[PDB]
Amino acid sequence: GSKTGTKITFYEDKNFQVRRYDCDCDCADFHTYLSRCNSIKVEGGTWAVYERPNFAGYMYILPQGEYPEYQRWMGLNDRLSSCRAVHLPSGGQYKIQIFEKGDFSGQMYETTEDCPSIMEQFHMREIHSCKVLEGVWIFYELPNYRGRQYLLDKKEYRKPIDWGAASPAVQSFRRIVE
């Protein structure tokens, strides 16, 4: 389709070296070309990488940006056994509704906007429920948009772990921009 979606490249080392590739596709696990993987290279689009095969395990988002080192992609332990392509949904409002309680109760905040530290704008250091929002938002464990991120697919986050979160520990967030 006289166009390109997104190109992901995984290498055992940094500087885009080793025995990596440079083609877009979908497979069970790129672990066939290289077990562990570090830095990456994305050209237009956000690729979703899972810790375990079958799109299962953690959730790392890589938006249009170059990552020569595992320090530029805010990684954890060069752990990746699965990869998939992700496209940004149409829109321009990005609305999120967070609940102080998991059972959708307490002080809830609604509205779009850039949020650096929740424990600042919303005065909350954690969230037990995020409920339905809009399009797709990224969750960061650490403030300033850092610490293993989480991809809020869909469904209803009845609990903090619902979005693959080991704990209700979650910071602010920010709309995705290509």
What approach was used to elucidate this structure? NMR
Instruction: Give how far Cα 33 sits from Cα of 2, 15, 51, 65, 85, Å.
Output: 28, 17, 16, 23, 18
The SS3 call for residue 174 is strand
Beta-bridge partners for 46? 86
* DSSP H or E stretch at residue 120: helix 118-121
Domains within the chain, CATH numbers bracketed: 1-88 (2.60.20.10), 89-178 (2.60.20.10)
Cα→Cα distances 171→16, 97, 152, Å: 31, 14, 14
Sign of CA dihedral 176, 83, 26, 69: positive
Euclidean distance between CA atoms 117 and 142, whole angstroms? 9
DSSP annotation string for 19-84: S--------S-GGGT-SS---EE--SSEEEEESBTTTBS--EEE-S-EESSTTTTT-SSS--SEEE
Counts for the chain of helices (H) and strands (E), in that order: 1, 10
Helix (H) or strand (E) holding 99: strand 96-99
